[PDB]
A paper describes a structure:
The remaining hits for ATAD2 (13/16) and BRD4 (9/26) were bound in allosteric pockets of their respective proteins. However, a halogen bond constitutes the primary interaction (other than lipophilic interactions) in the absence of a hydrogen bond only for FL10 and 23 in ATAD2, and FL2, 4, 21, and 24 for BRD4. In both ATAD2 and BRD4, while the majority (22/42) of binding events involved ligands that contacted only one molecule, a significant fraction (FL2, 4, 5, 7, 10, 11, 12, 15, 19, 21, 22, and 24 in BRD4 and FL1, 2, 6, 7, 10, 28, and 29 in ATAD2) were involved in contacts with more than one protein molecule in the lattice. As such, the hits for these FragLites may not occur in solution.
Numbering used by the authors: 979 to 1108
């Protein structure tokens, strides 16, 4: 229905705002663009499901997220990809892991404070209906 389309539109507006807020944070600059294979030729061979905030915006605009649950799975991928590709004790890897965990924690904290649980439940019920 048009009411269900309105619901998903509101979801996309909400997710674009959350994503924008993460992307303008200087801590999260490394997560804003795909890894350039030049710098990191082994990336695409180790990480099977690359994810970055530009890819998340693209997915929002392609109507790929019908729930906040599905969006947070891609935020979790940004975090787990960084924990897997950068696992060493050296400060460069520790800095990326801390920034990845902070992205993930920030996204979850914004959603906890600003997402209505009944709006998420409605999205989940429309998604399951199809
Ligand atoms: Cl830096």
């Amino acid at each position: 229905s048009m009411q269900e389309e309105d619901t998903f539109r509101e979801l996309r507006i909400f997710l674009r705002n959350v994503t924008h807020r993460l992307a303008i944070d200087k801590r999260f600059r490394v997560f804003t663009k795909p890894v350039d294979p030049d710098e990191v030729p082994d990336y695409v061979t180790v990480i099977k499901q690359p994810m970055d905030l530009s890819s998340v915006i693209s997915k929002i605009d392609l109507h790929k997220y019908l729930t906040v649950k599905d969006y947070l799975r891609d935020i979790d991928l940004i975090c787990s990809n960084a924990l897997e590709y950068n696992p060493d004790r050296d400060p460069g890897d520790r800095l990326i892991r801390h920034r990845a965990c902070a992205l993930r924690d920030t996204a979850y904290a914004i959603i906890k404070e600003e997402l209505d649980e009944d709006f998420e439940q409605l999205c989940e019920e429309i998604q399951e209906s199809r």
